[PDB]
């Protein structure tokens, strides 16, 4: 039996909507430090890891050392799509049911029977390049480019970040630097890699739950997107590089 209240229910709902792009089913792993969601997509290209610390919630109470709450992303998202502008959200549970309660205009409560979901967790990593930027800057650029191709090319040059889509009779390019103000910080070697555009584009909904993000990549190593949530929360997405 647990209970967690999110004041910004809308933003929380966009995190789960993002997870829903990669997973059909998942487990909320609930402990005294907060709630964790991990999973690998069917194509096995993306591993995702979301952690919402207890302090991320307005109220947080647990009865077990470790509670595992399996859910179907479509079903949880159908409910979360019912969220109103200024709703707070309370996630609560027992043995059989997961309850989502919206509060604000009036009080509305949905119950989903738990389902049994097989657990997850795979392989700490060194990256030769790290960038820091506003999530909205990232989201805007990736939405724009996502219609232009199937592969996103990323490379660094003298602490500058480049997003590239190589098309037919066209090539699209964006320069990200501290100088042009698009990056907050960028540091590391000159490296180059490419990733599936669909996977990267799926993370752009995190703009509604995150103001700041971190970007890590290297040659033939994953693209790591860390979306910083309040109170030390994060939404991590590791995307495998396309074969070279």
């Amino acid at each position: 039996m647990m209970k967690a209240k999110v004041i910004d229910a809308v933003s929380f709902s966009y995190i789960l909507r993002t997870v829903g792009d990669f997973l059909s089913e998942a487990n909320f792993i609930v402990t005294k430090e907060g709630i964790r969601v991990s999973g690998i997509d069917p194509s096995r290209v993306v591993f995702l890891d979301i952690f919402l610390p207890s302090s991320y919630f307005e109220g947080f109470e647990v009865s077990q050392e470790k509670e595992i709450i399996g859910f179907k992303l479509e079903d949880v998202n159908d409910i979360l799509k019912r969220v109103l502008k200024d709703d707070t959200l309370i996630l609560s549970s027992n043995e059989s049911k997961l309850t989502l309660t919206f509060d604000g205009e009036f009080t509305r409560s949905f119950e989903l029977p738990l389902i049994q979901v097989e657990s997850t967790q795979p392989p700490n990593l060194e990256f030769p390049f790290k960038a820091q930027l506003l999530t909205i800057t990232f989201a805007d650029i990736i939405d724009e480019l996502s219609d232009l191709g199937e592969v996103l090319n990323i490379h660094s040059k003298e602490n500058k970040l480049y997003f590239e889509v190589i098309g037919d009779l066209s090539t699209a390019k964006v320069e990200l630097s501290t100088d042009n103000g698009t990056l907050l910080e960028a540091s590391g070697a000159d490296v180059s890699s490419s990733y599936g555009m669909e996977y990267v584009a799926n993370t752009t909904k995190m703009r509604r739950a995150s103001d700041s993000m971190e970007l890590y990549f290297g040659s033939q190593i994953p693209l790591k997107l860390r979306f910083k949530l309040p109170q030390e929360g994060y939404g991590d997405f590791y995307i495998a590089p396309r074969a070279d």
Partner: protein
């Protein structure tokens, strides 16, 4: 001459559009009191009533009362785009049926639509004689949240009174829904005469409230113990849109 002019094409189309959630074969009744249309779903569960009194009408000329039988399936697309808040709407009888005239004050466009229609004898407007012990006022937006919530969870909606609260339930298996409405959260008004409880078709409630989206005025909802639900809204420009929902059992 059978002729009416309504001040706001957009409000008027909201009426036509509500009635359309029941049928596309509309019967307009031009009576001595104004115009009304009333239609029921095939199972007789949902009733839609458009009632526009002659006093809220900017022009009115009904020499002999008549009903007019229109298929608006194809013209409602035109009516939808031509209906502006700045436009007035005229409905006049022709030899072949009806003519709808929209005069856009902003674009200066005059849209005239001719519709073939059967003429009939004017039917009568009767509503159920029931006392609905429970009353509340809210807006369209609240009702549409509720409708979307319940239809997601199940096919039956149970509404009841729980001591100064209205309680709404749905789901008939694992997945459930519960909502509470109370004064100022979000009820504009609430009147609980005697404890009452009833169940209705979730689909029908959704079709009833889906039409109210074009009306911003306060919406009144009334029900009783195993009795029909009445949903009532007055358009800003005049006239009432009313839905009656038959109870289950």
């Amino acid at each position: 001459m059978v002729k009416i002019v309504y001040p706001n094409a957009k409000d008027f189309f909201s009426f036509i559009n509500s009635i359309t959630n029941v049928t596309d074969s509309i019967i307009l009744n031009f009576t001595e009191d104004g115009i009304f249309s009333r239609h029921l779903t095939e199972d007789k569960v949902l009733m839609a009533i458009m009632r526009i009194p002659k006093d809220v009408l900017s022009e009115y000329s009904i020499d002999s009362p008549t009903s007019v039988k229109l298929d608006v399936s194809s013209v409602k697309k035109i009516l939808s785009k031509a209906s502006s808040k700045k436009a007035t709407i005229e409905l006049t009888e022709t030899d072949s049926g009806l003519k709808i005239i929209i005069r856009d004050e902003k674009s200066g466009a005059k849209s005239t639509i001719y519709i073939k229609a059967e003429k009939g004898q004017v039917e009568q407007l009767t509503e159920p004689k029931v006392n609905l012990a429970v009353n509340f006022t809210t807006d369209e937006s609240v009702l549409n949240v509720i409708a979307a919530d319940v239809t997601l969870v199940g096919e039956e909606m149970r509404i009841s009174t729980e001591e100064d609260k209205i309680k709404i339930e749905a789901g008939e298996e694992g997945k459930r829904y519960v909502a509470f409405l109370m004064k100022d959260k979000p009820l504009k008004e609430l009147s609980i005469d005697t404890s009452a409880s009833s169940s209705y078709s979730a689909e029908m409630f959704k079709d009833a409230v889906k039409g109210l989206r074009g009306f911003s005025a306060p919406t009144m909802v009334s029900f009783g113990e195993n009795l029909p639900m009445k949903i009532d809204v007055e358009a800003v420009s005049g006239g009432h849109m009313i839905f009656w929902i038959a109870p289950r059992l």
